Amino acid sequence: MNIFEMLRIDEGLRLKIYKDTEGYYTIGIGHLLTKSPSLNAAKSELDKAIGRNCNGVITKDEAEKLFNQDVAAAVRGILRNAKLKPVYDSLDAVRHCALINMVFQMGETGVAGFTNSLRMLQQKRWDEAAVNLAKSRWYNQTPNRAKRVITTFRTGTWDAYKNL
């Protein structure tokens, strides 16, 4: 397991524009196109991202390209964020992936507001952090995914993803 395999499980792969769990137009492996309710606006964003008129469809290779860019942006984003970088650098490589996963899903500003959970993670209070992480809109709206990410933080193993 690695971050790409983890997020591929959590995000799926769809080659046509679809709406994500929040109702926002998306494509590929969780590539958010826009929060606009306009499909035409989403199609424009897609064409800009791919560099050709796609008319709402992409290839697997194009999906994977966007995915590589998006994962790298999540990581580099964490490193550029004064709240997230010290927590990230305090973690082991499996728990790194759990934090990247959260940022991929909800953005850096959103995860940097999990201030008390982040403190518990930095303190390596894993069971406490797990409890705290679950007291969130995140957990309530996407419980199965959040449970997997939280188990990853709790245990520092891939147990929640191995078998999937």
Swiss-Prot record:
Outcome recorded upon mutating N132 to M/F: 2-fold decrease in enzymatic activity
GO BP term (any one): peptidoglycan catabolic process
SUPFAM superfamilies hit by this protein: Lysozyme-like
A GO cellular component entry from the record: host cell cytoplasm
Recorded consequence of changing E11Q: Complete loss of activity
Pfam families tied to this protein: Phage_lysozyme (PF00959)
Catalysed reactions, semicolon-separated: Hydrolysis of (1->4)-beta-linkages between N-acetylmuramic acid and N-acetyl-D-glucosamine residues in a peptidoglycan and between N-acetyl-D-glucosamine residues in chitodextrins
Induction: Expressed late in the viral replication.
Class of this enzyme: hydrolase
Homology family: Belongs to the glycosyl hydrolase 24 family.
Full protein name: Endolysin
Source lineage: Viruses, Duplodnaviria, Heunggongvirae, Uroviricota, Caudoviricetes
Gene from which the chain derives: E
